[PDB]
Design a protein around this ligand. Structure first.
Ligand SMILES: OC[C@H]1O[C@H](O)[C@H](O)[C@@H]1O
Ligand SMILES: OC[C@H]1O[C@H](O)[C@H](O)[C@@H]1O
Lengths: 268, 267
C-alpha cells in the first residue's frame, strides 16, 4: 500500500504544518501516501480514533503526540513489526528511532539573551504537565539563569498567551520567555489591549521561529527549530527502516539557534 | 475506509481549518484521511497527483484545480469513486460542490472601503487566479467601477510583502488583500517603509484566519465559514457514498464582514 501514518498534536500550529511539509517532501518522492491524524480533532475522552488508527496495517508511523502510549506501541506496532519513529512531544524510550531538537540548549540561549539585555526578573509562560521536550526548555533556561524567574502556566496556544496577560501585569517582571511562538503572539495581543509596549514595557522572546515571527509588530526574537528539516529527517529515517527492517535504532538531535529581531531591549 | 483530501497547502491556516472541519465528520465515522498538499508536487507531469488520484479510495475531496476534469472523468467517474469539489476547483453541473460566496465577499470588502470614504483603491492578488479568487475581484469591481488598480503578486505573506513597493508608488489609500496571508505581508512591508495602518493605508483582507486577531492593528476581513465548509463537504461526500444515485448537489455558503481596526475613514 505504501502508506505512512502521521500523528501530530494539531495542524493549526504553523510548527506542525511545516513538519508535515517536511515529511510530505520525502514521501512524495517515493510514492508514499500520508495518513493524517491530528490528535486535537479526536474529541473523544480516551482518544478512540487514535487507538483505532494506531491498529491499522500501514507501512509505518511517525509519532509526534504523547497521546500514543508506550504500552500501546508495544502491543500494536512492536508486536506486529510495524516500524515507527518518535519526535517532538512523544518521548523516546530508547528502543526506537527518534529525531529530537535541542530543547535544552534553546532554553539556555533564551536565558542568555535576556541576561545580555540585563533583565533580572523574568516570567516563563508555559503549559502545565508539559511534554518532556517543552519541559527541557525550562530546564535549560534555569540551568544558566540565576536571577528571579516566575512560572505562569497557561494553554499552549495563542489564546493561552492572551489569557496569561492579566497575571503578568500584576508582577514586577520585565522580560518574558514564551515557550512557543503561538504563546508569544497571544502575549502581543493581550499586552496591546493593555496599552503596554514591546519592547519598551516588556521584552519578549519566543520559541520555534515560525514564519509569522517576521509579520508581528515588533518582529519576534525567538529560538529557531529546523522544523522542515526535522520533518525530512524523520521521514527519511522511517523509510530506511521500511526498506531494511533490522537496521539499528537511531536517535539524532538537530541543533537550534537564537534569531534576534526587535522584541527585546536592554533594561534601562 | 479512506478519503483522499487534496488541498493547495496545509501551511495556510485556511486549509488547516478546512481539514479540521472535514475531520470532525470523518474521524467519528472511522475514516482514514489521506492528505495531499498539491503545492508540493513540483514534478513536470505532476506525477504524485496522478499516482494519488489513481488510488482505490472510498472518495476524494478536491479543493485544488490541479486535478483536471479529464483526469476526474477517466479515473474517478469511470471507477465510480465518488468525489466533491470546492474552493479552487470549479464545479460543473455533474458533481457535488460546496462553494462560498466569493463575489459577494468582494462586494462586501468594496462596500466597506466605500463607507470608509476611500476613492482610489488597490486590489492585491495572484495572477491567473483560481476562479473562486477571481470572483472576489469581480465582486469588488462591481462596486468600484473606476479608480481600482490591480497589483499582482504571489498568494502568500511574501507576496504581500513584495507588493508594497508598487503600492507606495500609487495614490491609493485603501487596499483589498485577496487573502489574509497577503494582508500580513502588507503589514510587514508597510512597517518597513514607515507607513501606518490605518492612518496611511486602510487594509481589508479575506478569510478571517485566527491570526487576524493577533496582528497590529487587528485585521478587518471577510470571514469564510471554513470549519463548516469542511463539515458540509465531508457530509455531502459520505451522502453520495451511501447513495450513489443522489442528484448532484451544489450548495453556496455565506460570507461576511468582520470589522476590526485596520481601516478608518479617509480624512
Ligand atoms: O510550537 C509548538 C510546540 O509544541 C511542540 O512540541 C513543538 O516543539 C513546538 O515548540
Ligand atoms: O487563503 C487561501 C485562499 O485560497 C483559497 O482559494 C481560499 O479560499 C483562501 O481564500
Amino acid at each position: 500500500s505504501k502508506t505512512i501514518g502521521v500523528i501530530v498534536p494539531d495542524i493549526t500550529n504553523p510548527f506542525f504544518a511545516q513538519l508535515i511539509r517536511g515529511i510530505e517532501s520525502v514521501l512524495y518522492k517515493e510514492n508514499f501516501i500520508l495518513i493524517l491524524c491530528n490528535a486535537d480533532q479526536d474529541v473523544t475522552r480516551e482518544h478512540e480514533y487514535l487507538t483505532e488508527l494506531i491498529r491499522r496495517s500501514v507501512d509505518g508511523f511517525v509519532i509526534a503526540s504523547s497521546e500514543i502510549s508506550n504500552q500501546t506501541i508495544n502491543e500494536t506496532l512492536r508486536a506486529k513489526k510495524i516500524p515507527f519513529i518518535v519526535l517532538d512531544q512523544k518521548k523516546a524510550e530508547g528502543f526506537s528511532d527518534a529525531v529530537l531538537t535541542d530543547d535544552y540548549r534553546g532554553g539556555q540561549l533564551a536565558a542568555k539573551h535576556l541576561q545580555e539585555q540585563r533583565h533580572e526578573q523574568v516570567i516563563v509562560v508555559m503549559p502545565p504537565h508539559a511534554p518532556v521536550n517543552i519541559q527541557q526548555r525550562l530546564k535549560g533556561f534555569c540551568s544558566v539563569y540565576t536571577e528571579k524567574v516566575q512560572l505562569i502556566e497557561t494553554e499552549l496556544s495563542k489564546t493561552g498567551g492572551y489569557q496569561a496577560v492579566p497575571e503578568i501585569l500584576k508582577t514586577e517582571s520585565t522580560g518574558i520567555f514564551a515557550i512557543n511562538d503561538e504563546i508569544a503572539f497571544g502575549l502581543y495581543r493581550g499586552l496591546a489591549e493593555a496599552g503596554k509596549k514591546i519592547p519598551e514595557d516588556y521584552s519578549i522572546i519566543g520559541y520555534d521561529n515560525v514564519d509569522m515571527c517576521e509579520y508581528v509588530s515588533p518582529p519576534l526574537t525567538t529560538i529557531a527549530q529546523p522544523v522542515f528539516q526535522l520533518g525530512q529527517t524523520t521521514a527519511t529515517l522511517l523509510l530506511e527502516r521500511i526498506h531494511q527492517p533490522a537496521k539499528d535504532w537511531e536517535e539524532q538531535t538537530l541543533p537550534v539557534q537564537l534569531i534576534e529581531r526587535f522584541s527585546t531591549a536592554p533594561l534601562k
